[PDB]
């Protein structure tokens, strides 16, 4: 859906991030993203559950941790992690240029592994691990 302009409104403080699907931009929010503050639609949940921990022949997750898709992605360098974040989600949810800042960062701990927990509009849930296991059954 039209995520860019919805996030624009979130940034203007005239829409709540928890009332949009941060995975596709759908307004039909019936649940919560299990990793980050923000809504999620049923389509996106069905995709996550479907492309759950699929891996490419490079040893990394095939799809973006946020939107379960992505064209060009950033890869985490933290062993037991192997997650990917696409440049489109990063630039939209973290902020314009953050992806290139993170590519320049050497090495790079991804937003799932960082200590900080908040990165622009992208906010990690304190209870993500409980929420995540619950997500998968």
């Amino acid at each position: 859906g039209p995520l860019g302009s919805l996030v624009y409104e979130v940034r203007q403080k005239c829409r709540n991030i928890e009332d949009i699907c941060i995975s596709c931009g759908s307004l039909n929010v019936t649940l919560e993203h299990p990793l980050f503050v923000g809504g999620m639609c049923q389509n996106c949940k069905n995709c996550f559950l479907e492309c759950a921990y699929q891996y490419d022949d490079d040893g990394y997750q095939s799809y973006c941790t946020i939107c379960c898709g992505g064209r060009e992605v950033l890869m985490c360098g933290n062993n037991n992690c192997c997650r990917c974040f696409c440049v489109e989600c990063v630039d939209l949810l973290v902020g314009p240029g953050a992806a290139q800042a993170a590519i320049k960062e050497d090495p790079w701990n991804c937003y799932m592994c960082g200590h900080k927990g908040t990165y622009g509009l992208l906010r990690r849930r304190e209870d993500w691990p409980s929420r995540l296991q619950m997500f998968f059954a």
Binding site: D56, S62, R71, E72, V73, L74, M75, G77
Partner: peptide, 8 residues
């Protein structure tokens, strides 16, 4: 961070 393109 290293990058890759995906398999769309």
């Amino acid at each position: 961070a290293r990058t890759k393109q995906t398999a769309r």
